[PDB]
Symmetry: D3
Subunit: 155 residues, 6 copies
């Protein structure tokens, strides 16, 4: 928002490769240790229809069909994290979309190799986040809770 910005939210999804390679906890832990507030979480198998909409911007790219099929092929961990500048900061935490360009210390820099098996998706902007959160979650899945760590993360 514009109050303090602290209620900004982003959508993050661990892709099937992240689940298969047993990196869910590792990924969650990095967001937790950063100070962000987990406000929604579910393991789902996403429909192709949802994924087509999710990735509509990429519909003209040659990998689009396989991306959609692959993301529909197995479990995904869908999440919403909340905090100041969470959208941009989460993109920084995960690293460049192509792991080859993601420095060590980022999730993709540390844990994967190839752009099509890049572990995670994070919203690229506040507007994309609003759209992605709405697409993947119902409103009643976004939890309001009193974060005891807020005091130590925010001035």
């Amino acid at each position: 928002g514009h109050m303090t910005g602290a209620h900004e939210r982003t959508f993050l999804a661990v892709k099937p490769d992240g689940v298969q390679r047993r990196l869910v906890g590792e990924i969650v832990r990095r967001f937790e240790r950063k100070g962000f507030k987990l406000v929604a979480l579910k393991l789902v198998q996403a429909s192709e229809e949802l994924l087509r909409e999710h990735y509509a911007e990429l519909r003209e790219r040659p990998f689009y069909g396989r991306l959609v099929k692959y993301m529909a092929s197995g479990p995904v961990v869908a999440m919403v994290w909340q905090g100041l500048d969470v959208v941009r900061t989460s993109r920084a935490l995960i690293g460049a979309t192509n792991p080859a360009d993601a420095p060590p210390g980022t999730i993709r820099g540390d844990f994967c190799i190839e752009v099509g098996k890049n572990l995670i998706h994070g919203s690229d902007s506040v507007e994309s986040a609003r759209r992605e959160i709405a697409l993947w979650f119902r409103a009643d899945e976004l939890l309001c809770w009193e974060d005891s760590a807020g005091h130590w993360l925010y001035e």
Copy 2:
């Protein structure tokens, strides 16, 4: 059900607040269990009364229910051979005082009322708890590429 056995695990509000969700999940992942359901919820007192019905005559029942309803919980289902009993071993004794180092409660907790997690105590309790907390369409079946390296 052998390798398809399932257990219910919930990270309690203290585990969420202390930022130990990832740590807990990681321990189950590294053990080789298969995550088949997961959600962040705020459970109603009604659900929790039913969850803990066996304990209704204990003096801590009311506060346990209120506490578990007071904040977010991470509900989970894990699948694998002897996962119910093995999960109990990984988490440690219900009372952290009796949970050795290396277990979740042994490493992270002090008091029985702030003991981070609940895990099903038996296959029958797991069936009941899974049904109570999850709909069938929240339980995912997936083909585990690691299964070959964990099982015969």
Copy 3:
């Protein structure tokens, strides 16, 4: 005390081997993650006199002299931790005095090999803790602070 027991304190010292082998942080982290409250901490070089008094109970053992000399030979990290049953629980976290008998998951079980190079000392009882705390720390080195994590560790 007897109120709730939550203000019990224990004395822990990282020995020179723990400093040399770069395990100070690892050891502190294990007490932090357990939920105990750090109420004193200092790096010191302990005098032989203090150590003779500290280990008076062992004065008849053949290794007493070398123990005293060794503990005086390098930096020690002196600590006081506070919490319910902290004395006994800390002993469990550190493991048996002899690392050969300390199971994996304990500090000595994970990190050292021989009884004379066993990384750490923890008070063996509430009375020894009272004595050790008094010996190593002045009262004004024991800090009273409001522990925000207390709410999540104590019912």
Copy 4:
């Protein structure tokens, strides 16, 4: 230059969030030698002196009040280029600009809750070390790893 020293302080947020060990471990694993350490509650007067250069900034008063409000872990680390390298390990003062892999990049969000203070220069380090520690708190020890860290 192996005997250079820097002053580092874990702020109350780092103590509260149980990150003292994590922070120390990062300095240990880098190869630096811990030569002083204490848990203290610093007076406002000490902190006013510590942060004197910032006295005209709008956040000065609250910075001082906050730093005095809870326990801090004061430390001195020793090694080649420790001042500048510690700054690199901690990351930008403002966590917004600190990349993942740094302490603030991994653990913090806001400049006012940024876990730690490290000396910004050798001159500031000398001043800060002297302010927080007495000479007899600074230990000399022979580092068995030194052979494997320094050519």
Copy 5:
């Protein structure tokens, strides 16, 4: 007794699950000294000899076939009571009986996929070391940590 040695092998499941580094790190952090190491594919002939004591057990044939089926990381570690202590670090042969904190307790489920083999005695270690390594693969090096690990 500080020069005792044991043989450890990471089994194909440990390599496939990418736990080699994790396993090595546990022995390193304990203080033991790595004196030999190689990635190999063992022949069934070698493995039959390795596990000759088990030749009458019903799982012998499949154990041999499985251990020959893919790469193994063979190792020798040195230190006081390394044989017995390594067995404790790895945990009970059946992971069902291996407590959390042990390698098998933390990482495995089933006795047939139990990540690692460690010598059961000093004599078996001598025999296993000889079987898997040539003499010139066992390295003598001066351990800078030795002074901080041993009396």
Copy 6:
């Protein structure tokens, strides 16, 4: 491109500081496939040839002597763009320039004690792999993770 290979060696400082497991774990967690591994002490003759491109540099002689002075862990890792990516994981040759999150950024201080050597190109890797390993030490194995790492 997925079958590209690089040569990595943990230098004596990495072995002495007990960071072998840590280093291996970083390559494993990235997704690369370990296809050769051994603990060795290299001769000066081998090392002279290994570092021949640096023969005119003032540190060449000391580098050769140092690398011959104790055990090294030689490795080959396989995967897409593994040469360039391994260089990124290890960080700048000089640790002063290597950011936190890299191996040298997290663990080292000085260029001469920089823990590890990684091939600087595909061609140098081919040459280094050939120099340090016999062909029969490079293992081909079926990687269960391949499906989750590659398209």
